[PDB]
């Protein structure tokens, strides 16, 4: 698949990694009683019943891994260096997949990470992921390099589309790029000043920044999904079976409720073993920095849950039957009230 032209820049934008600024404690563990993180049973629905169900669920009380994106460095009206967390090097085992809590803090007053004394209203931002079968290091020894075909889930268009592609990422050799000099971390970015016009959003802004660090080769697919903009908390999930990689989301079926339904299957058949968060930095001017909501990643495992299906079929309440002894009791009677 033709995924557009290669970047023609001789250098990448310099990336400043300062993890201290991203070491925040904003815990939002899975609350199963509020049905957080639940992927709806896939081939069917139920109405007005309480039953146990076996499937891939996050654990009750799991804090997950918090990630937060920030504004880059600036001087007045001229954005400079990107500002990121050490995320690209933090490679996790995929296991059975994961769910992501996105935009939970939206509408709250938060912090601009790059400037701790500066407050701003928190806005939802979508996570970017890099997933694959094999990992290792880059030319200078830093980790986070993926080999062969890598699945990249890269939101773009200032949060209006999700772009999913499976391709070989060939590190570019220019300045601050992964096969070049003075490399730290790759990162994606968009520049609101030119990319997020009220009308014409740049649907390739994040793709184009990704392309500055890597050449995309042998892409087997590139798919896009549309996202209507809002500030609503949503869940995203990813799993993998013999049929491919399954992408789940709450926004196309249960927007306000949060249950996740499958929206896509990707033809990715090698086993995903590793994943990482692609750090993203927004090249805002100094005078227009926003607070971006943190997202939380929680791992899935084959658990039995007690699921309370409402008349309209949504799961609003659940019990993690292995959480504690009290939970085991509720599950054995298949009821929330014993």
């Amino acid at each position: 698949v033709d995924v557009g032209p290669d970047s023609v820049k001789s250098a990448c934008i310099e990336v400043d990694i300062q993890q201290t600024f991203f070491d925040k404690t904003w815990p939002r563990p899975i609350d199963v009683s509020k049905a957080d993180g639940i992927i709806y049973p896939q081939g069917r629905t139920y109405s007005n019943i309480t039953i146990t169900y076996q499937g891939l669920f996050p654990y009750q009380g799991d804090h997950g891994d918090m990630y937060v994106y920030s504004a880059g460095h600036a001087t007045g009206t001229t954005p400079q260096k990107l500002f990121v967390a050490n995320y690209s090097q933090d490679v996790k085992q995929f296991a059975n997949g994961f769910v992501v809590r996105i935009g939970a803090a939206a509408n709250s007053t938060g912090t601009v990470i790059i400037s701790p004394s500066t407050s701003a209203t928190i806005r939802k931002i979508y996570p970017a992921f890099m997933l694959g079968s094999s990992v290792g290091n880059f030319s200078d020894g830093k980790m986070g390099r993926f080999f062969n075909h890598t699945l990249v889930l890269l939101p773009d268009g200032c949060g209006t589309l999700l772009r999913a592609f499976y391709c070989i990422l060939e590190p570019r050799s220019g300045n601050h790029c992964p096969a070049g000099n003075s490399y730290t971390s790759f990162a994606t970015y968009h520049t609101p000043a030119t990319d997020c016009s009220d009308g014409n959003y740049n649907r390739n802004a994040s793709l184009n920044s990704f392309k500055e660090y890597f050449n995309l080769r042998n892409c087997t697919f590139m798919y896009t999904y549309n996202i209507t903009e809002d500030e609503i908390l949503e869940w995203f999930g990813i799993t993998q079976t013999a049929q491919g990689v399954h992408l789940f989301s709450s926004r196309y079926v249960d927007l306000y409720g949060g249950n996740m339904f499958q929206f896509a299957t990707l033809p990715v058949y090698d086993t995903i073993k590793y994943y990482s968060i692609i750090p993203h930095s927004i090249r805002s001017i100094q005078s227009d920095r926003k607070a971006w909501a943190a997202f939380y990643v929680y791992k899935l495992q084959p658990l039995t849950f007690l699921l309370d299906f409402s008349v309209d079929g949504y799961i609003r309440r659940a019990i993690d039957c292995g959480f504690n002894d009290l939970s085991q009791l509720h599950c054995s009677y298949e009821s929330f009230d014993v």
Partner: protein
């Protein structure tokens, strides 16, 4: 065309015998097949709407 009758059915691979009735929707529409607490099929969203 056969509401109220006992019919054999095969709905997207799901089969058995039963009687269909026109009624108020419950469950998630997108999931097509509505099951009860004993895992019987108890409702269905048809492609005719």
């Amino acid at each position: 065309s056969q509401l109220g009758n006992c019919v054999e059915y095969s709905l997207y691979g799901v089969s058995g015998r039963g009687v269909f009735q026109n009624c108020t929707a419950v469950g998630v529409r997108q999931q097509r097949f509505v099951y009860d607490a004993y895992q019987n099929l108890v409702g269905y969203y048809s492609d005719d709407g």
